[PDB]
Design a protein around this ligand. Structure first.
Ligand SMILES: CC[C@@H](c1ccccc1)c1c(O)c2ccc(OC)cc2oc1=O
Lengths: 97, 99
């Protein structure tokens, strides 16, 4: 992945298809649209411009970049889908000069 | 060098001489830093982050030293809760996501 184009890929969370962004400066992962169930615990996340209320789920099956992992995911009203350092490390990715 | 991502990819750079701590961000298009004054030509901008919009000022042709390399790039400055170097600077450095 060169950085001349946005690092956007397609991921399958519990079977649902979504286009996420590979974000190295995000500690967690927020996506919108997905319906994951009734086992969540509320969170408050904050970035540039303010805060966003999210619902947190643990151990969610994710298939992306030809790999299948289990990670924590947050659903909320975010203006852009993000896969942060938590999924990225679990997937084995690196940032190199 | 290589950055595992178990910890935030944070580094020191110099915006026209002044040292600041920034985060390497692959999901952002532009770059924005707080607390610096420059003399380059500027124009006011409004960026929208993950939480809402923020008022800023954009400078063109600024000289930056990061990782022992020098580049002339575009950067924004305002009251941001975290300083970041977006993809406009990373590409000019030659960084890449590996797997
Ligand atoms: C400060 C780091 C950050 C963040 C992401 C998720 C949760 C908390 C913070 C952040 C981006 O990485 C970003 C990326 C792309 C973008 O597009 C406009 C906007 C962006 O706003 C941001 O606050």
């Amino acid at each position: 992945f060169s950085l001349w184009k946005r690092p956007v890929v397609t991921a399958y969370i519990e079977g649902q298809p979504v286009e996420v962004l590979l974000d190295t400066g995000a500690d967690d992962s927020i996506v919108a649209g997905i319906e994951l169930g009734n086992n969540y615990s509320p969170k408050i996340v904050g970035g540039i411009g303010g805060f966003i209320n999210t619902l947190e789920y643990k151990n969610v099956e994710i298939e992306v970049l030809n790999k299948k992992v289990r990670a924590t995911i947050m659903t909320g009203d975010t203006p852009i889908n993000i896969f942060g350092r938590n999924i990225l490390t679990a997937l084995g990715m690196s940032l190199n000069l």
